[PDB]
Amino acid sequence: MKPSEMRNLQATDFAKEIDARKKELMELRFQAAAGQLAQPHRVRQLRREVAQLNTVKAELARKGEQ
RNA sequence: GGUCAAGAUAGUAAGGGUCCACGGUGGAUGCCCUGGCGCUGGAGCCGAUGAAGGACGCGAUUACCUGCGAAAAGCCCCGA
């Protein structure tokens, strides 16, 4: 979610995690359009989640290739 | 008391005037500060790593502002 249990993943295993959230985020976007969003907090959570993956994939790119 | 005569004089206000009472309109005066001005001192350049300044966006709901920038009213570390 946030500490060291996030960086264990390989190359395509990072792009995979993003894609699964973007898809969920879109299913929620469609849910919003048809008056079905009972859990709006889920929206920001996934956006915070995708941000974290994208931030870390840049940390590890510099904590190796310098 | 009655009739006639000769006199003289009053009230009525359609509307108006002055004063009084009570309102309405209006935003002066007073009180206040959420905002300004001056002087004294501090500080004093930003930009091809893309500035000043903008456009369009980012909200469960978002028209304006603010804050951001497709990682979008926020993501990571250190300190309080």
Swiss-Prot record:
Pfam families from the UniProt entry: Ribosomal_L29 (PF00831)
A single GO BP: translation
Keywords: Ribonucleoprotein, Ribosomal protein, RNA-binding, rRNA-binding
UniProt xrefs under PROSITE patterns: RIBOSOMAL_L29
Stored Gene3D superfamilies: 1.10.287.310
GO cellular component: cytosolic large ribosomal subunit
Example GO molecular function: rRNA binding
UniProt KW Oxidoreductase keyword: no
Family indicated by similarity: Belongs to the universal ribosomal protein uL29 family.
NCBIfam families for the chain: L29
Protein's job: Binds the 23S rRNA. One of the proteins that surrounds the polypeptide exit tunnel on the outside of the subunit.
Complex and partners: Part of the 50S ribosomal subunit. Contacts protein L23 and trigger factor when it is complexed with the ribosome.
HAMAP family, per the entry: Ribosomal_uL29
Protein name: Large ribosomal subunit protein uL29
Organism: Deinococcus radiodurans (strain ATCC 13939 / DSM 20539 / JCM 16871 / CCUG 27074 / LMG 4051 / NBRC 15346 / NCIMB 9279 / VKM B-1422 / R1)
Primary gene name: rpmC
